[PDB]
């Protein structure tokens, strides 16, 4: 919920 | 400041004039979606474009490592003893219409996210740690009991009570408390279900930043002008225009000097940008990590736990390490990346100086001798006939779910396959081809997990509190290879323990964790990255420094 695929 | 071979700041030798108009663009092949309320905004393009207006009304300054400091629109203070965050808004913090920013405007942010009537997608579990907030979120309570106002709703102070303190609470992006205000007096009569589509949050908002949006062209652009009521330093510039530019038109736009600054340009275009006369290209360390995962088990969704129960030679630590030491990441980067990808030594990106160290050693240097020796001494014995290794009669053969994405994705994947052949490991692509991104996400995130891949790559944009729990803990659905290790669990808990309220202790906990992950080799760090930004040589005071808090007020032009 903090970090994203990318 | 440097980032690789790049300068972080453009030190213009010429003085800024008084006034001027800065022309900025964001590279996107999709339209921006204007939404000035942080809690309701889901478009990264617009989030960046909102910068001159206050970045969707962020309150807190930080240092270059994203640790909160005093001196922004508000201050936050943590008191362990009372389990409370105290947010103190500046006396002269005002909205762009001259109205006061008050304690209620801060609380109202929580309502926009937690009350489902507004339709936010930004609720997180972390917010359930605020006393009374879960009950508000489910409609059980009409108010948020853990948020109180020492000086009332029209005062400047807010206290937020937690069930437990967390050491990440001193980092921006922690998620345990929010960092933006929303103009309650301006929006109080808009039905929650209509708030996201209201003119008042799209074309005609109130903001707190050094500039305000005088004109918003849906999907395209913002005309920014000085915000007379900004608490801080009056800007140098008379105006800023911020526009979307397509990938296909960005390079031409630099050649014609249509934009002073273009943000979000992709790594492939760098060679076309490097040579442009009239521009200084700035670089900065990204909040990014790419890594290789090994498939070691399955995820039990009902019990929220990873179980490391997959039959595979990758259960052997020597095998996991050898497959990492065999790769030629540096060589790959040197051929293809233009210095924009650099080999990772550890899982935490080096921009987090307070949470990592370059002394941590991983797989950043190819060592085929070591890889071969590791497999030897573990019983994987080479063949005369085939070039591949065998143990108890079975060949060492693995499936690599490599994916599409990088401009040379095919070539990079093949290179690794060839390195693995050099150590007697036979590696093939999943279904003989690269995986599409959406296929890859599905394959990796649908419980219980697949049994038909051995190696895969993942890459993450990390928040400014670089939490490892939601990526690698025993309970995490994003633990794609499903390892479960008592030492790593201990290490993760220690990072988030009360002892880690001490920054030196926490750094040591992050370092141990990174060492332990590299040694165990359930995952292998691959690359860090650099972002670049071209800057017209007339711009004064431009910098990519993450600790630079007043760039929109300081920035100017020399002519």
CA–CA dist B535, B263 (Å, integer)? 10
Tell me how far the alpha carbon of residue B241 is from its chain's centroid.
26
Of B125, B174, B463, the CB nearest to A3: B463
CA quadruple B172, B173, B179, B180: dihedral sign: positive
Closest chain B CA to residue A2? B463
Query: Would you list the domain boundaries of chain B?
Result: 1-285+527-559, 286-526
CA–CA dist B88, B79 (Å, integer)? 14
Instruction: Put residue B219 in one of left, alpha, beta given phi > 0 → left and psi -120 to 50 → alpha.
Output: left
CA–CA dist B109, B96 (Å, integer)? 18
Residue with tokens 């936010």: B120
**Residue B134, CA distances (Å) to B72, B75, B140, B147 in order:** 29, 25, 9, 12
Which residue in B471, B479, B523, B527 sits closest to B323, CA to CA? B523
> Could A5 and B460 be called an inter-chain contact, meaning their C-beta atoms sit closer than 8 Å?
yes
Residue with tokens 């995952």: B523
Burial class of residue B472 (count of CB atoms within 10 Å of its CB; 0-12, 13-18, 19+): buried
Which residue in B165, B171, B212 sits closest to B69, CA to CA? B171
Pick the CATH number of B286-526 from 3.40.30.10, 3.10.105.10, 2.60.120.10, 3.40.1000.10: 3.10.105.10
CA–CA dist B227, B207 (Å, integer)? 9
**B397-401 and B455-461: which strand pairing?**
parallel
Mutate to test the interface with B, among A3, A4, A5 (most CBs of B within 10 A): A3
CB contact set of B530 (below 8 Å; sequence gap of 6+): B3, B4, B6, B283, B284, B285, B286, B339, B340, B341, B342
Residue/partner pairs of B43-48 with CB below 8 Å, 24 or more apart: B45/B244, B45/B264, B48/B263, B48/B264
CB contact set of B331 (below 8 Å; sequence gap of 6+): B366
CB contact set of B81 (below 8 Å; sequence gap of 6+): none
- Token pair for residue B475? 């309970």
Residue with tokens 């060839």: B418
Residue B270 near residue B428, CB atoms below 8 Å? no
> Could A2 and B470 be called an inter-chain contact, meaning their C-beta atoms sit closer than 8 Å?
yes
Structural element, H or E, at residue B159: strand B157-161
Residue/partner pairs of B39-44 with CB below 8 Å, 24 or more apart: B39/B109, B39/B112, B39/B113, B39/B118, B39/B120, B39/B122, B39/B178, B39/B180, B39/B182, B40/B112, B40/B118, B40/B119, B40/B120, B40/B195, B40/B196, B40/B201, B42/B121
Separation of first and last alpha carbons in chain A: 13
For residue B341, list its beta bridge partners: B529
**Residue B421, CA distances (Å) to B105, B312, B317 in order:** 61, 18, 19
> Could B467 and A4 be called an inter-chain contact, meaning their C-beta atoms sit closer than 8 Å?
no
> Could B465 and A1 be called an inter-chain contact, meaning their C-beta atoms sit closer than 8 Å?
no
**Residue B2, CA distances (Å) to B19, B239, B322 in order:** 30, 30, 33
CA–CA dist B349, B462 (Å, integer)? 9
- Token pair for residue B433? 């081809």
Residue B372 Cα, gap to closest chain A Cα (Å): 33
B175 to chain A, any CB pair closer than 8 A? The answer is yes
Q: Using a CB-CB distance cutoff of 8 angstroms, which residues of chain B are in contact with residue A2? A: 173-175, 462-463, 465, 467, 470
**B397-401 and B426-429: which strand pairing?**
parallel
Q: Which residues of B394-431 are buried (b: 16+ CB within 10 A; e: fewer)?
A: eebebbbbbbeebeeeeebbebbbebbeebbbbbebbe
Q: Using a CB-CB distance cutoff of 8 angstroms, which residues of chain A are in contact with residue B288? A: 6
Which residue in B242, B190, B183 sits closest to B215, CA to CA? B242
- Per-residue H/E/C for B408-456: CHHHHHHHHHHHHHHCCCEEEEHHHCCECHHHHHHHHHCCCCCCCCCEE
Looking at chain B from residue 275 to 294, which residues have their Cβ under 8 Å from any Cβ of chain A?
288
Structural element, H or E, at residue B225: strand B221-226
For residue B180, list its beta bridge partners: B58
B461 to chain A, any CB pair closer than 8 A? The answer is yes
């Amino acid at each position: 919920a903090a970090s994203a695929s990318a | 400041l440097k980032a690789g071979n790049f300068d972080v700041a453009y030190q213009n030798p010429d003085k800024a004039i008084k006034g001027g108009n800065l022309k900025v663009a964001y590279q996107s092949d999709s339209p921006m979606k204007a939404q000035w309320l942080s809690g309701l905004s889901n478009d990264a393009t617009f989030a960046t474009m909102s910068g001159p207006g206050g970045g969707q009304d962020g309150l807190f300054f930080t240092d270059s490592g994203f640790k909160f400091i005093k001196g922004g629109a508000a201050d936050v203070a943590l008191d362990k003893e009372s389990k409370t965050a105290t947010i103190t808004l500046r006396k002269d913090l005002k909205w762009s219409d001259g109205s006061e920013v008050t304690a209620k405007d801060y609380e109202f942010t929580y309502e926009t996210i937690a009350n489902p009537a507004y339709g936010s997608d930004r609720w997180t579990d972390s917010l359930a740690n605020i006393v009374g907030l879960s009950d508000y979120h489910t409609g059980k309570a009409k108010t948020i009991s853990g948020i109180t106002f020492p000086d009332g709703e029209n005062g400047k102070v807010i206290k937020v009570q937690f069930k437990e303190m967390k050491p990440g609470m001193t980092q921006s992006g922690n998620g345990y408390f929010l960092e933006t205000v929303a103009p309650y007096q301006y929006l109080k009569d808009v039905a929650p279900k209509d708030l996201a589509s209201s003119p008042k949050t799209t074309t005609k908002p109130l903001v707190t930043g050094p500039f305000k949006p005088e004109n918003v062209v849906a999907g395209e652009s913002i005309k920014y002008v000085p915000n007379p009521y900004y608490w801080g330093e009056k800007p140098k510039l008379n105006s800023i225009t911020y526009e979307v530019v397509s990938t296909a038109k960005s390079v031409a736009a630099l050649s014609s000097s249509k934009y002073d600054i273009i943000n979000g340009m992709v790594s492939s275009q760098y060679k076309q940008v490097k040579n442009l006369k009239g521009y200084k290209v700035l670089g900065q360390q990204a909040m990014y990590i790419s890594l290789m995962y090994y498939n070691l088990g399955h995820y039990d969704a009902k019990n929220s736990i990873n179980v490391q129960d997959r039959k595979t030679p990758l259960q052997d630590q020597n095998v996991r390490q050898a497959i990492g030491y065999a790769r030629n990441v540096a060589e790959v980067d040197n051929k293809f990346s233009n210095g924009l990808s650099t080999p990772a030594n550890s899982l935490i990106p080096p921009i987090f100086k307070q949470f990592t160290s370059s002394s941590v050693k991983g797989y950043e240097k190819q060592d085929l001798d070591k890889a071969n020796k590791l497999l030897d001494e573990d019983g994987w014995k080479l063949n005369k006939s085939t070039g591949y290794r065998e143990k108890d009669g079975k060949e060492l053969s693995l499936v690599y779910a490599a994916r599409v994405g990088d401009a040379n994705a095919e070539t990079i994947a093949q290179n690794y396959i060839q390195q693995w052949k050099k150590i007697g490991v036979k590696v093939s692509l999943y279904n003989g081809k690269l995986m599409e991104f959406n296929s890859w996400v599905d394959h990796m995130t649908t419980p219980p997990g697949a049994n038909d891949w051995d190696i895969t790559d993942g890459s993450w944009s990390l928040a400014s509190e670089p939490s490892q729990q939601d990526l690698f803990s025993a309970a995490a659905p994003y633990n794609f290879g499903h390892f479960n290790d008592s030492e790593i669990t201990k290490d993760l808990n220690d990072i988030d323990s009360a002892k880690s309220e001490n920054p030196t202790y926490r750094k040591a906990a992050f370092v141990k964790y990174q060492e332990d992950m590299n040694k165990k080799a359930y995952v292998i760090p691959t690359n860090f990255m650099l972002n670049y930004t071209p800057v017209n040589k007339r711009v004064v005071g431009m910098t990519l420094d993450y600790g630079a808090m007043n760039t929109w007020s300081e920035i100017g032009v020399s002519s």
